[model samples]
Target: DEASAVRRGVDFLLDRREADGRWVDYDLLGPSDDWITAYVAGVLVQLPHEAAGRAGRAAMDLLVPEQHDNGGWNYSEVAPEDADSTGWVLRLAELLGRSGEPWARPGWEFLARHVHDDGLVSTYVPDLAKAAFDRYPVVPSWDGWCGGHVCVTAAVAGLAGLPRREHVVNGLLRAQRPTGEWPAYWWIDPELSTALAVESLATVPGTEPARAAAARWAAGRIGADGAVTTHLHPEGSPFATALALRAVAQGEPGFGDAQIRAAAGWLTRHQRPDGSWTPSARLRMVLPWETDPDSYEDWTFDGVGRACLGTIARDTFGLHTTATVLQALRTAAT
Candidate 1:
């Protein structure tokens, strides 16, 4: 049953592939970039199917040229270099078995500069970041999202084999919430941030207790139907559900077969007719007074918003969300 569901999901992705070999989606930041392509390729290659190879190769081709001269990827070509997108591209290169390739060196170098003395990667300057926090009283976190600085540090170190691995891991361990979930700025819920932190810390030996603790938190949140919800919404979120499953799967004694199967079954039941999962709306902070109520247009503090509002773009990361779910389904099936 999981196999069939995986098939349908794979087909849905293949059908949506752009002629340019990359997948694009809407985001407040702009058009999608190498991040989603790398994500999709990573999932496809894990599946033992020919379609995976064809699609994976195409995605890789598109990503190679997108790398900035400084060795990082922006949300798009026009965007600036930042820790989150750069770290993801490094992971993508590693997933495609290109970590040792020439292109990867610059990415690694680019990422190194972004890590601050605080042992966290810098995505936003402090002042603007605080503005976002001020505006979004509901989420009210100073670290913001995208797993904050620790998540970026873990991802970059994990993928690029960079220096300060131990430091990065320790940073994440320190940042773990009492409940075990790490909050993400880009995702609407904590599941994805927690998932990313878990996966990034998976190989670290001393982190077993931390990883297991987070896994339990995620597992405990799974509904009877096997879906995990982050909010008070009537329906569960596909992104959060898949992310929680992936997080659990990567931990030590992470998931029992029964748990995996139940979650996989829920995903199978929820796949849309088009084979794609619906996008989850990310909660973003904005200066309400400056925005047009009707269009929700962000008209004030142009530079400030860009620096702080990294995750709260105008759109959802649909392609990225789909790739994440596909990977979860494949991992669950295996």
Candidate 2:
């Protein structure tokens, strides 16, 4: 079932691959930019050998051409100049089987510039943050969360074989709540906040308390089949669940293969006929600022405003989630 199941899932996506050879998304009713295109490439690389060979090659052609000059991807060809985006592009490169390629240097250099002497990652570098502020002009005091940002930073760093991993690990550890919980953001339900806490804790070597806390939270939120509840956002689908499983595997090492099986099974049962997923399947990402976001609000960057971004100040659902979930599925399939 695993092979057939995953094949069916991937085929559903490839079936929709455009004639122009882009993996399209529902966002803005248009083809995704390099951000999403890169993720689609990652998913193809995860496919079973045959599917991967065909789709992954196409993906490489598409993605390689899009690589920014600085060794990362940017929305509309505009790099964010942050460790986060650079790490993601590098990880994608590695996933595409491009390790040690020349493109890795500038991206590596970009990340090295950011790791502070004390290892604190300021969300907004003075220059970039100031420009973003001036250009977009939003409310003041909109700092994002610690755990989510650091977790992504750690994940990307971990994958890229960055030096000073312990520093990134400590960055996440410092964000851990004294109560052993990690917040989905600074303000939200304790039960809801555990996802990032658990995921981040998985990467660190000895965060058993964090792992237990995350598992307890999962036990309460997810069903017996390992399907997560749609509490905060529309992300509890098989994709999110699989990603959560990936995190648990990393953070909660003692989790048995049975748990992995259950998650894989649940995802198998709920997959869309076409291999694509909607947010409604698992969870609803909600926020305190815009409690009841409309469809536009929900899908737009609004929902991510403070809640999801607090984790890393990055938007979700588009390409990031796709890459994350596909990686999780690949890990589980192994």
Candidate 3:
């Protein structure tokens, strides 16, 4: 039954049976619903290659309809173009193997056009700038903040083959706390933020001293079971588990053999009867009242059970978690 549940979770999206002749978006709350659906479609492509011929096609179809006139997406589907939206869509395209294609070329060009001499992509346009500023105070970067776009900029830098990779590196370095951990770009989950900071610190050039401090900060969040702690919350979730695993697997904090085994066990225990996992209760409720603690089915909370199921499809099964997790897993055997 667990086996069938896992297969069904994978097929639920991969089935590609939408009436529009395209993959449909998730009903989950968050900006990444459509964007992540595109990402999931890309991961599924790694298997069937033909992908039921609809899952991948459906993902692309969903993304195509959401693209703005200037080739991007916004939190609420705003007008004109925004760097953050463009970054997310461009990220979606890159993951889907569409980077070199003509349709995606303009989006990269758009990043280049906005990238300042300092090599930063400014968060402008009423829709984009407002959100960015609300998240980060303007500072010595002498540039605009793009919320999580800081990570997006670095990622796009790698893909666009930008010469300013160091600039993107510096932006993150500047954001780090004196204690070696950095605040997350807008909206990053706490656990994810720690995982990201660990990864970012790993990429810095020739800095062992800083790396040690970074390790200490990251380790502070790790539990006895090896789960990374949530950003502002008390406990951890599978989301953090998957992300931290990827970070260690990449040599960030350098998880040892024993640590990995423990983590694998933690994941296995949490795997649902349906072969999926739920987001951490820490994420679902700001307070315990949001969850019954006893009832599995009736919690009025934030995370989508199906959303976490998608997470399980990607993590435990190795068929999902596009971009970082997919990249980490692929690099494992080599």
Q: Which candidate is the best by TM-score?
A: 1
For candidate 1, give the lDDT of residue 124.
45
Candidate 3 Cα RMSD after full superposition onto the native fold (Å): 9.1
Candidate 2, TM-score vs. the true structure?
A: 0.69
lDDT of 3 at 315: 29
Off by over 4 Å in 3: 1-9, 15-33, 42-54, 61-66, 76-82, 113-124, 127-151, 154-164, 178-180, 193-220, 231-235, 252-255, 280-334
Return the number of clashes found in candidate 1: 6
Each prediction's whole-model lDDT (CA): 0.65, 0.50, 0.45
Q: What is the lDDT of residue 42 in candidate 2?
A: 64
> How would you encode candidate 1's per-residue C-alpha lDDT over 1-334 as one tens digit per residue?
6777778878877877888777776654456566666667777877777987788877777778877676767666544556677676667667767778888778767766665555666554344245444655765443433223544554554663665666666666777889888754334467767877777777667777878888778777667888876543458777778877877776565354556666777888988877777776344443322222223444232122354353243225356666777888887865
| Candidate with more favorable, higher lDDT: 1 or 2 | 1
**Model 3, backbone clash pairs (residues 3+ apart or across chains), number:** 4
Q: Model 3, range 179-274, lDDT digits (tens) per residue?
A: 655443332343354455454445556545544555555445456786655543345455556555544443444544444445445555555554
lDDT of each residue in 109-212, candidate 2, tens digit only: 65555565555443224444344445435644323311134434434535535656677656656755665444432222333234444544454567777667
Q: Sort by lDDT, best first.
A: 1, 2, 3
Superposed Cα deviation of residue 4, candidate 3 (Å) = 9.7
